[PDB]
Design a protein around this ligand. Structure first.
Ligand SMILES: C=C1CC[C@H](O)C/C1=C/C=C1\CCC[C@@]2(C)[C@H]1CC[C@@H]2[C@@](C)(O)CCCC(C)C
Ligand SMILES: C=C1CC[C@H](O)C/C1=C/C=C1\CCC[C@@]2(C)[C@H]1CC[C@@H]2[C@@](C)(O)CCCC(C)C
Lengths: 239, 10, 239, 10
């Protein structure tokens, strides 16, 4: 088999979108409220999540067919998938050696302990770390990583989605280019596509647990006041 | 409302 | 003349309230999003204003009779006076030499230029600097400074105020202790009380100009997203 | 609403 020019241009647009929205230098992290090592890590991690949401919006706008959707569908997909894309894209900084996300200096080295200092419990942090480990072990090509983010965002089974048909057609076209990429470009990846689809189910379960834990902190004004307007809007329950 | 989201989406 | 035990205990409660809420070390300023020298100073100054609002709430709760008022009246007084109290209390860091607010290191030295980098124009910054200069030249005792803040906050002529009678009785009692303090404790202050009352009128005009300029930035989501939830709530138009 | 203000005012 061989993949078409149409499938090849989808890949080209997605890796270009990811290169424009993911700053490998982590140079903007100095602009966030500093890390502090109750809920001492909440200001810094709220700033990091807020910055990541902007990057996800930027990536989403460069996905073919996303901008063409209605503003309501664009908002529904982002409000629902935002946290899953953040967890996926965070895998680029994840280190199997330290079991932590490393973003330049030791100031931006986030371990499991720093995340408990932002209000999270091991009911979320245990499956999240186990997710990062298994994702990293997949040794995904940049092409597969970006296709997975685009498939995750363009999921039609999200609350608020009106044009299910159109969104599923965009997601199916993205799954086809992923299956064909793995088949012809990934050596010994006969089981990879199925493993990647399982990671999407794991993300749904992580989103569930994150929504529960976020609800716990958003209901305490002394904690919610530490979040950013963008985090409040995106993780909010407004329809 | 989604004022920020609407703005960031152009 | 001599002032009573009741007037003396009002003074004692107010300076104690101010000492509890105004950190002369400015040690928390390191926790704000760093200063950047469009609207590069907005994140840092939004964090500084947000922190100052919390300190004003803390001061207000220690004013005799404030906590006794209804939650609605407490909110109306703070939503209306918050920016005036911030401008008053900022006078402690203001330097006549540099024509700037100095808060420890040169990182927390805010000149007129840094404030334009947060969205303000000279239509506000010119009367604000001229206000700080004249306030500093009054050489107010700590007792007078704290009484002025309490009189400013307990103004009955604010939108949303229901118990005007009660609030005016609290403000009149505060004005009486100020007049008696200046008379018996401030040498050569026969013209001071009138000069202090004029500074309150100047504050109203500064609040007007600040509300206009804040409206200009709150209506631009790319700028309003840089504010904090507490700044949005307090400077907001919600009733 | 004033959720933060209500909380900070106890
Ligand atoms: C966001 C990126 C992308 C760029 C880099 O790779 C760094 C990175 C790290 C992400 C992490 C490490 C810290 C905790 C987070 C950010 C987790 C991903 C999700 C998790 C979280 C569940 O704790 C969110 C916190 C939500 C709070 C603040 C409401
Ligand atoms: C708040 C304190 C108290 C503790 C210290 O003395 C320092 C201080 C400084 C206050 C300043 C210097 C910077 C600009 C401000 C803070 C101005 C007072 C008001 C003004 C402002 C008009 O620009 C507000 C900015 C509002 C924006 C962020 C919406």
């Amino acid at each position: 088999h061989m993949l078409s020019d149409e499938q090849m241009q989808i890949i080209n647009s997605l890796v270009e979108a990811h290169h424009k929205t993911y700053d490998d230098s982590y140079s903007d992290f100095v602009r966030f409220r500093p890390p502090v090592r109750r809920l001492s890590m909440l200001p810094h991690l709220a700033d990091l999540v807020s910055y990541s949401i902007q990057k996800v919006i930027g990536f989403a706008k460069m996905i073919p067919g996303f901008r063409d959707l209605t503003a309501e569908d664009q908002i529904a997909l982002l409000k629902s998938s935002a946290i899953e894309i953040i967890m996926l894209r965070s895998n680029q900084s994840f280190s199997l050696e330290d079991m932590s996300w490393s973003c330049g200096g030791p100031d931006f080295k986030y371990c499991i302990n720093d995340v408990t200092k932002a209000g999270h419990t091991l009911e979320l942090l245990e499956p999240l770390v186990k997710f990062q480990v298994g994702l990293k072990k997949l040794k995904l090509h940049e092409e597969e990583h970006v296709l997975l983010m685009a498939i995750c965002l363009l999921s039609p089974d999200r609350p608020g989605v009106q044009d299910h048909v159109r969104i599923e057609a965009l997601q199916d076209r993205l799954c086809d280019v992923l299956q064909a990429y793995i088949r012809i470009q990934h050596p010994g990846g006969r089981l990879l596509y199925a493993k990647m689809i399982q990671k999407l189910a794991d993300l749904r379960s992580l989103n569930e647990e994150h929504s529960k834990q976020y609800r716990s902190l958003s209901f305490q004004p002394e904690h919610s006041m530490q979040l950013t307007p963008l985090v409040l809007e995106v993780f909010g329950s407004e329809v | 409302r989604h004022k920020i989201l609407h703005r960031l989406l152009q």
